[PDB]
Write a protein that binds this DNA or RNA. Sequence first.
RNA 1: GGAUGCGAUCAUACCAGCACUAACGCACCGGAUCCCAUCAGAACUCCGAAGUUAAGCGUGCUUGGGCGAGAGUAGUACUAGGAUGGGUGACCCCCUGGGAAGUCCUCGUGUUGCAUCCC
RNA 2: CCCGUCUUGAAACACGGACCAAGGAGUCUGACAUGUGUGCGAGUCAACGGGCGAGUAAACCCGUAAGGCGUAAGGAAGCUGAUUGGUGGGAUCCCCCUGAGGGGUGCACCGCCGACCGACCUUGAUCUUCUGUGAAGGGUUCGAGUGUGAGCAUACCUGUCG
RNA 3: UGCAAAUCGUUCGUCUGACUUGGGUAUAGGGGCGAAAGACUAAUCGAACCGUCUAGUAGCUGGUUCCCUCCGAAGUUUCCC
RNA 4: UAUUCUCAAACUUUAAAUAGGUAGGACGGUGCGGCUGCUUUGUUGAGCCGCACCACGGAAUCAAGAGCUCCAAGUGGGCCAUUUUUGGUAAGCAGAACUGGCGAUGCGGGAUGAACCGGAAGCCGGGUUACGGUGCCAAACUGCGCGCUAACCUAGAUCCC
RNA 5: UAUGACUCUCUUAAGGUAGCCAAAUGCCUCGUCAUCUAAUUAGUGACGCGCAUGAAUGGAUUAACGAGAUUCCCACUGUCC
RNA 6: AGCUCAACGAGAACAGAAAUCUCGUGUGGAACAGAAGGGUAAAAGCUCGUUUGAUUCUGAUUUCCAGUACGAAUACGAACCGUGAAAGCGUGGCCUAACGAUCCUUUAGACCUUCGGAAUUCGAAGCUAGAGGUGUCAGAAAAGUUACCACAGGGAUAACUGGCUUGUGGCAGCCAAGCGUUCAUAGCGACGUUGCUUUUUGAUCCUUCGAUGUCGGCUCUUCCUAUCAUUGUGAAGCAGAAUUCACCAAGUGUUGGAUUGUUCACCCACCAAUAGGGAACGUGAGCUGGGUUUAGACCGUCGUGAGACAGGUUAGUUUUACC
Lengths: 49, 98, 163, 186, 103
Amino acid sequence: AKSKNHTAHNQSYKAHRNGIKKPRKHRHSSTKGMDPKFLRNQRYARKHN
Amino acid sequence: VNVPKTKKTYCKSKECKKHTLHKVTQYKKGKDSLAAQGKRRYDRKQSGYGGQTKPVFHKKAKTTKKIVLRLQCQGCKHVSQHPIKRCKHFEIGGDKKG
Amino acid sequence: PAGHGLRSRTRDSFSRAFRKKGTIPLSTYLRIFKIGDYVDIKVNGAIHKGMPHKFYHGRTGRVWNVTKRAVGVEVNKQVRNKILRKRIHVRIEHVQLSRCTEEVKERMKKNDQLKAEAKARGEVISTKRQPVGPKPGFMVEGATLETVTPIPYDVVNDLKGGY
Amino acid sequence: GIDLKAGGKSKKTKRTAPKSDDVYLKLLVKLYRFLVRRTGSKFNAVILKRLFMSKINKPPLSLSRLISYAKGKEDKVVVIVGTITDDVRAYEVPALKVCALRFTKTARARIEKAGGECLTFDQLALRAPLGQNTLLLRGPKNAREAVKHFGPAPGVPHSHTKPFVRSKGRKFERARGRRNSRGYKA
Amino acid sequence: MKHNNVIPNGHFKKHWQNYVRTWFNQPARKTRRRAARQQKAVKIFPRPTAGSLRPIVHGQTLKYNMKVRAGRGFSLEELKAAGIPKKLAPTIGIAVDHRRRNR
RNA sequence: GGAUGCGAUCAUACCAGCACUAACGCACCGGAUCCCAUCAGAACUCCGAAGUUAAGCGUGCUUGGGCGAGAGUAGUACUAGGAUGGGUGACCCCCUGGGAAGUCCUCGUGUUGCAUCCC
RNA sequence: CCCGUCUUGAAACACGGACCAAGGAGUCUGACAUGUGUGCGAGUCAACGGGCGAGUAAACCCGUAAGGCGUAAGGAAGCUGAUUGGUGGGAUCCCCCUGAGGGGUGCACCGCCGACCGACCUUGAUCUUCUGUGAAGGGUUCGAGUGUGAGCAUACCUGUCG
RNA sequence: UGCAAAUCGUUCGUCUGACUUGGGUAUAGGGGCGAAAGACUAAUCGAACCGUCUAGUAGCUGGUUCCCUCCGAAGUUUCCC
RNA sequence: UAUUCUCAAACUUUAAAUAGGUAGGACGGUGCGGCUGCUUUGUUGAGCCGCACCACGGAAUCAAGAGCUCCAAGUGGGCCAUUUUUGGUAAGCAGAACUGGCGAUGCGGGAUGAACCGGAAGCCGGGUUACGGUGCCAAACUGCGCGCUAACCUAGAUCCC
RNA sequence: UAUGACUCUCUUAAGGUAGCCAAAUGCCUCGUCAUCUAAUUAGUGACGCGCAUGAAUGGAUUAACGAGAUUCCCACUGUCC
RNA sequence: AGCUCAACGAGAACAGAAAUCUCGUGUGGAACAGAAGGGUAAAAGCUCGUUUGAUUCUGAUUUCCAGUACGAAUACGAACCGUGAAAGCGUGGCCUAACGAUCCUUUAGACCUUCGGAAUUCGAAGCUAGAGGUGUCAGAAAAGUUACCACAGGGAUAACUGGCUUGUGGCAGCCAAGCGUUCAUAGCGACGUUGCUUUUUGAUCCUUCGAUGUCGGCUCUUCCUAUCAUUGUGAAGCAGAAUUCACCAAGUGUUGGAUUGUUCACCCACCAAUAGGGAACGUGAGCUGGGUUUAGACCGUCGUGAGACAGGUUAGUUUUACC
Ligand SMILES: [K+]
Ligand SMILES: [K+]
Ligand SMILES: [K+]
Ligand SMILES: [K+]
Ligand SMILES: [K+]
Ligand SMILES: [K+]
Ligand SMILES: [K+]
Ligand SMILES: [K+]
Ligand SMILES: [K+]
Ligand SMILES: [K+]
Ligand SMILES: [K+]
Ligand SMILES: [K+]
Ligand SMILES: [K+]
Ligand SMILES: [K+]
Ligand SMILES: [K+]
Ligand SMILES: [K+]
Ligand SMILES: [K+]
Ligand SMILES: [K+]
Ligand SMILES: [K+]
Ligand SMILES: [K+]
Ligand SMILES: [Mg+2]
Ligand SMILES: [Mg+2]
Ligand SMILES: [Mg+2]
Ligand SMILES: [Mg+2]
Ligand SMILES: [Mg+2]
Ligand SMILES: [Mg+2]
Ligand SMILES: [Mg+2]
Ligand SMILES: [Mg+2]
Ligand SMILES: [Mg+2]
Ligand SMILES: [Mg+2]
Ligand SMILES: [Mg+2]
Ligand SMILES: [Mg+2]
Ligand SMILES: [Mg+2]
Ligand SMILES: [Mg+2]
Ligand SMILES: [Mg+2]
Ligand SMILES: [Mg+2]
Ligand SMILES: [Zn+2]
């Protein structure tokens, strides 16, 4: 007994019931993933500020 | 594939911590010891009645293995292990391509 | 993976422009990128390192990191019922400085100048620009009028250049 | 028909009265309903709204934290809609005017010995009908065990949520998914 | 199984319903023990109801070695030092323990 | 008004055939002991200044090719939305909007940054 | 159009149902979890047991260094063990003036970045029982940690599981 | 929905033998017994009958009992003998 | 060599419509001073931090308000329609894209019908319409007008049909 | 002409001998020929590279027997007209 | 670092279409391991020199995606190196695929931790990183048969009818190259092309699996026309006779037999004719039961075997109406 394989029918309606949610952007963003050397220097500068 | 008999590569031994000459050999799995806890447990489980108590793999699919190179640093005599990609024919110190 | 390779369906997207292949002009490597800059992602098919995924091609994002050869870009991506700020690293060859905010600083400066002038003369004004509105009335000078009528039909003219 | 969501009706639920059956709390609620209606004071409105809240939404405040927050404001009446507990880590107790729903016996004894007073909200209304010269304080709402288990699932990247485990030890959820040497880490 | 819950490990796979012990007789047991104590006190009158004297001993292991509790009976060395013959001590309300060593 | 050195843009700058260029340059050019390099001092490398503007570089012309811009193709092809629109159907008219591309024709053939030098 | 049911679709040439009465199916228990009510609170829990007491299966009382949970975490382990913050928003209140104003106050919660404890790495003056200590100085590493506690008992609905 | 959970009518095979038959006796369940049909073993046989484990387990079928009021879906993604 | 007929889902110089991304301030700007172990030949830059001043809210429309968290049900057979579209001669066949609908939804119209047209609904009085109709069945003209058709084949008579 | 008494070879040890057949065994098939009938996919006899016959997994025949499967003829008749 | 490829043009003894060599043109029309698509010309291609960045440490991100893991890839940081004069490049292959959890085993690393009465030494157990593999590739350890059969279900799914469709089958039309002693159309209609029908067979799976009795024949009624005969007509390559084509036309009729279970088929015979079809492929509580399609049994082929068989053979219970 074969069945349907795939479809995107009704998915946009589901997404729009509560979406499309845009996360609130804060003034300061996380520094994870940035150049480690630059972050090290910035931390030292803040320490001696 | 053919790999050279010797290789200059990094050695993380405290004595060297740098690139040194290494001799290249092929790793071989050592003999299974009857004193290993897993083997002892398996032997205890198999004893008595009940037949085979653990799975026995049958559906072999791979036609090759991953060759591991044993690089023994000539300075400190310590060994590092380096796998290579799957191959059907492997040799060490073979004649160079003409 | 899962039925589609990394560069699947990129025959046209990642190809280079006609008669524009070969060496890359030096201007690409002389650009300056800084945190907060808006950039456009345009994949150069000749640079295979630091290539963004095809999805980010043709999308504009903001710079959040600056390495030796690449720049970090934050690009919005819609996944079901929310927008994800996906952070990627892309080589400068694949990125171009965006003009999406070129007029902002100019407009702010002019608004500040106009507000200062209005305050000097003791008036209250709005510096907001407005959409094009209806035009007022005006007089048009009479001239010779050319009459337009429907064309009599001719089957022989149904083909481009005639049958 | 009309193109409205749920016929234009609200779908948000908020407390409009205490769920408790404490008669004294009901009398306080009546008092502050009258105050809110006939004064329009923001402080009174906040007090009334907090009077409705549940136990976990009225966390206690420690004596040491109260002293720290009252530093330099000892002349003001500090108000908390909740309980005030004692802290054995606080050594010097100044004279404080403190109003709360309840005081622990040790905290009340220490406050009264230090020369302060412990007030109820009716006394606060008699003293500060509009909340004038008060220090409104809240306890740590998210500082409880249940909160640690909230948030992203323990097994997803960058998650520090505490998992639910019957016991703590090497044999309890430490092997696969927590180590590079057993499958994957995190 | 569903949701984020602690992994269940209920040990209820045997005929546990046939091995349930209830405590509906707890007050009855208390009454019976009190009656036994009263009968014993009447029997041993005028001997003390608390029973024979017991020694003072230390708690075992590092967790309780600071604690002092009651031991089974006085050692032979203690009885000898106190001048009480070991065969007489039990008859005069003193418990005797011939096993306990004095270190 | 140019040349040279380093470039930006990367054909309006390219390709082909003809004609021309004061000075400084750039070149062609004379040798192989040395450094260097090959089968080959052709190339590369080094040392030079006898000769030549013959070539390169530069400039100009071609009812030249290409390239770039415009006009036209054409409100055409196509296309978003509408109809209890026509038609048996294939397809198509109409309403509210957007709107291309060969052929043919006309024009143009680089513009420029820093430094040195000639005029 | 005949109800109930499964179904994309039932008045169905789909199944059950001749009719009436009575009986008839998410319960009890154990382990958790969120929520809410109540008590106390860095504690909380006397009901294993004991003293008694409606002449009494109730109620009342009792925790000695008892025990359970909490009050400290990180390591496989040996083992070590929290120097006590800053900042952008932010409720309430206090002043000057009545502007979508300025100054002070800055709890809850959120964002960002330091610091401390521990696994790992790195580092090393001085002492020292010679293998320990730790002036200074760290890290794109790791934690269900710390940075003035928030738990314990108990009631009920709901949810997973035996 | 029979006189009958195998019977009735006509017809038919054999009929001194490997013949038919009563009673006694022996073989009992993965066992017996079988001139062999998986036949028979008390209307039960390709594993009898009786009690118990046992309310055996079912991703499958069928049911799942008062009223009004408010909110109100999904047949799509990934993984799984 | 210069022309010429006709072509492409896995050809293409050129190249739409529709659709996709970004931005349009109070998390802004300007001027000074400061921190660094990063960077530079160079307090040259790069970030960050203080002080002082300005900042009419910086496009339209709307905003039955915005954000955050916890526990959990059911569902995980779908089906139909305009347009785009694959296999197939085709199918009330089989499979995809956007949107809507039925399923879960009555009500008026299409005689009749899950999907078409209209339109979505608390219980009522009055008025007016949508789609569709006004010879009878059957509420509303055999209403006012112009042409065509005469069917001795059951003339013909309304999207889906 | 055809076949092959005869010689040599391969898989895998041998290569279907005596017999029998469109068989209760043959797909093509209602095979081909003769016979039986007015007419026969039936019966009989014959032929045989026989899909896939064959020698105690027994081949061939066989008097006598059979509530066994088949074809034909005489007698007989309400099976039928 | 140096060089430029395929191809073409013009030349050089053997030498020619194709050997080697010279010049010119040469946008890649070559090559780059493999499929294809991109990409590359003082290179990513060819030659040569030096080499092992196919190295060590963990983190971050992308693709997949639940924003889990694995695989693959990308950008930094912290070391040690290769090459180059140097910038610079190098963390395998120009890019897009080429691969693998738990448990166990085994190897490498530390003057590392533990064996719980205390020491030493073997042995064992730990920590970090690889290797032995699950291809059903998020990863059980796995041969048949049942016609002697069983259960829970499924019209989520086949074997009838019915429904859509009509490829195939069947039945018609249009044009007119040709056939027909000459003459396209008396009678036909090649190359093409438009239709109709559901008595063929397919395609599909909508209804029925707590069941709609599954071939054929016998009996009986009715209905259709695409008319075999019969009534009345037009046409002819219609002298007569016979025949053929076509038009109204379904009132009436369309048979007796051999073989086969047969539908179908093929013969004998008569006849005016021996036309074609529907009605749940009409009709089993109307019959029959020869065939298919349970259990017995034989043959052939297949299988080691139990057994199988769109092969053959023989025997095998047809229930109920009074609503
Ligand atoms: K065993
Ligand atoms: K839960
Ligand atoms: K049902
Ligand atoms: K029914
Ligand atoms: K305690
Ligand atoms: K460890
Ligand atoms: K049995
Ligand atoms: K299932
Ligand atoms: K689910
Ligand atoms: K052989
Ligand atoms: K014989
Ligand atoms: K017989
Ligand atoms: K590489
Ligand atoms: K699998
Ligand atoms: K079996
Ligand atoms: K047809
Ligand atoms: K069917
Ligand atoms: K059925
Ligand atoms: K017949
Ligand atoms: K018989
Ligand atoms: Mg044994
Ligand atoms: Mg010249
Ligand atoms: Mg030209
Ligand atoms: Mg204790
Ligand atoms: Mg698109
Ligand atoms: Mg509508
Ligand atoms: Mg009305
Ligand atoms: Mg023979
Ligand atoms: Mg015979
Ligand atoms: Mg090179
Ligand atoms: Mg492995
Ligand atoms: Mg091990
Ligand atoms: Mg003629
Ligand atoms: Mg007719
Ligand atoms: Mg008739
Ligand atoms: Mg055999
Ligand atoms: Zn070494």
